[model samples]
Target: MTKIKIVTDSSVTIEPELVKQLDITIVPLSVMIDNVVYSDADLKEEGKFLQLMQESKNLPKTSQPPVGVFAEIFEDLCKDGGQILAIHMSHALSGTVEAARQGASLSTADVIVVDSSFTDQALKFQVVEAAKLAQEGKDMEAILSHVEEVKNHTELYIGVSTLENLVKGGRIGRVTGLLSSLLNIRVVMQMKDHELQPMVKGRGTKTFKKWLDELITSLSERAVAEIGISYSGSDDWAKEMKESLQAYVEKPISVLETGSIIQTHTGENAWAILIRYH
Candidate 1:
């Protein structure tokens, strides 16, 4: 039997327990605040990285893991005759997937890199399923197939309280970002076709909640298998939404805090809803 090892980037934001139980290898992306660099895992545990972003004069920056890092990890994992199924954030969102592709070429291991075509816990939907399949003794090809299937069914919706980080990151138009910031408006965006497309915008959290309710109702009309909620500095809000969603979704719902890369663009007080439907 070929030992299959699963690999993913930190942007997936998978639950810590699943990472350990599944033996998933996560390559950390780099985050820079005031010229000091921290690994993705480090900033996530720092717990105050988002707070620092508010005080910093410049918007925080993120960089993909170096090719050498991936090369080393793949080489090390292959020592025991293992095959790697490495999945990462969307190529449209970051260069990490490309870096993984290059690094896989440098490694002697039988490595296959996949572009998840999404980010946040939305990508986690794919990683966890792939990890489960691998643990069931599935071959690399079968695991990869399962990953692709999950990607097709998964949907991502992001709600951000402010647009400061989006403007600073140059992800949103300066005029729109400024207008939203001045008005304290909240926006909900969906990750579709490998891009973040605006789905709804509202004047306050109440309006955002209304939009969310409608979204959940619409999703409930379909067959939803699993759901995950991730928040950027808003655990209470995540829990609230999870409880409300529990009534509509029959499957399990998982919640976790968002990491640096997501915060770099969405800012604080943001929430991401991920859905996987059959």
Candidate 2:
């Protein structure tokens, strides 16, 4: 059986250990702060990108890794008689997936490109499963089938204290004037079918607390495989979610600061809960 090499983008917020242990190759997206550009991988330290974003004159812009870089990576990885499986963030979230597809076409390597249709740890769920299957010497057919099921079972829920970033990023535009004017606005969004759908909206910290309670109550009704908590700026809320959601899933929850690329859209004090159900 031919060995498989797993590839992904930096939009995934995963533990460094998993990357090392699974030998996943990450093509980093970048964030521009003021006039300076920094790799998303380099800004993983807790609050590093947030600090930079706060100091910058404006909201930072995120960039997808170049198509040429992906082609080179694909070509190099397949040189040793190994096939490549490159999974990336949603086509809705960024052009990284499209770039990967173009890159694969440009190279002579047998690279299979896929859109995870999600980002952050939600995307990580599929990547981790695919990498594990590849490590077990599974063929592309088996890996893709398994990953497709994983994607179906996955969910991403996000809570934001401010809608400013969404308005600026043009992610949420209909209520741009109404949502941002109220300083205490809080929005809970659900990622469904490659778009951010507002689940709930209100003011104050209790809005999220109420939603969290509802989510926790609802979890008792289903089977959960894994959960990961990612936050922008601060992680206090992520820690609290871990303590609460830990009972539902067999594996311990992963609580990590989200990557810079995601932070550019989510802004400060935004936290997301990602779950993969059985």
Candidate 3:
């Protein structure tokens, strides 16, 4: 049987167990901290990257996977006549997707490259479903279309405790003019149209609580497939979110630490809620 290989970058925040379970290949992105570059996958341990980010004199710089790396991987995967499906972070967030495309073109492999339009576990939903379909002996067309269905149903909401990282990363641009000026401003942004659009803003911790309450109310009216909670620093709050959202989702909500690529932009204590619907 010719297996279709599923690939993604380290920006995805899925349980390591799932990556191994699905036989998914993750090409790593690297982050530079104090002039030392570390693989995104290596810095994924909880609290490991956060402390480094906090103490660093300068903001950490995240680098996407090189086009050559992707090309090499694509060529190797197709060695045994295996096809490749590469789902990656949104082009808005990183150039990893474009790199994959460039890499695919360099190889003779049959590679299907897709921009997830959303990262974290939202990307996971697509990759996981695609991998499952591939393992079931589905062709590229079947897997791609089903992954599209999952992508349409996926939603990603992020809560950032500060705008320092966003400003430094140049992700939010000056669009966060108001929040950037104020200290301790809590903001909730939704990943829409390949951009992070601010949805709500306020001060103090209650701001997030209120937003989550509203999200829970809204989710009650929809059919949810799964929920994943990814955080930067501690799991204290991630656990709370998992417990609160557990009622709406039947599967065990994955509470995992996000990787260096995301943490570099979101900073410490930031959390993202990724939901996929039926």
Candidate 4:
């Protein structure tokens, strides 16, 4: 049986041991902290990079790895007679998917690039599934289709403590950010059509939890394939939230660290619960 190569961007926050065990190629996203560029090295380092991104006065900027980087990864795997499946951040959120697509075109081997309409844990779950397909001896078409299914079946909502990060990144209006901060409102955001879109507003942390409960309650009817919880240095809060939603969402939950790429923008005390339904 021919081996398949599964490629994922580092924004996914996959555990290093799991990545190495599965032979998945992790492409790093460039995160600029204090005007210095660091790729997977800084992003993968647990304490230091996360702290730097969260505590820095200037918010870090995330950039896509160059097309050449993808080309090199694909070429290497192709030379070794491997089929490549490169999944990455949403096109609307970043240009990583486009770069991978261009790189695939340049390679001789068949490289399938998927634009997972999500980031962070929501996207990482799909990459894990791709790795599973490769391990299970599934064909390339099946893996490709599975990735697209992940895009459709996945739904994500994040409750932000403050909109300062979004505002600083020009994602939110300054006036709105200020008003929300002053009122201590929790802004509800969702991935809509491959980009982060504001959904509604809630007051404080408890109210946000209520909003999340309602979301889980509604998703109970959908077929849940997998679930994961991501928190920005707030594991205790994450555990509490997961327990609360356990009755409604009776599935295995994997707790993932909010890596530097996500913490770079969202700051601390932010938690996201991702559900992948069938």
Q: Please provide, for model 3 over 168-222, each residue's C-alpha lDDT reduced to its tens digit, 9 standing for 90 to 100.
A: 8878762433445674588998887787778889877788889999999998689
**Model 4 stretches astray by more than 4 angstroms:** 172-184, 248-251
Which residue pairs in candidate 1 collide?
Answer: none
Overall local distance difference test of candidate 4: 0.76
Give the residue spans of candidate 3 off by over 4 A: 174-180
Each prediction's Cα lDDT score? 0.83, 0.88, 0.88, 0.76
Off by over 4 Å in 2: 173-184
How many backbone collisions does model 4 have? 0
What is the Cα root-mean-square deviation between model 1 and the actual structure? 2.5
TM-score of each: 0.92, 0.95, 0.96, 0.88
- Backbone clash numbers for all candidates listed: 0, 0, 0, 0
Model 1 C-alpha lDDT per residue in residues 112-135, reported as the tens digit of each score: 999988887888888888888988
Question: What tens-digit string does per-residue lDDT give for candidate 4 at 165-197?
Answer: 766665453222234444346767776675566
Clash tally for model 3: 0
Residue pairs with backbone overlap in model 3: none
RMSD of each: 2.5, 2.0, 1.6, 3.0
Stronger candidate by TM-score (1 vs 2): 2
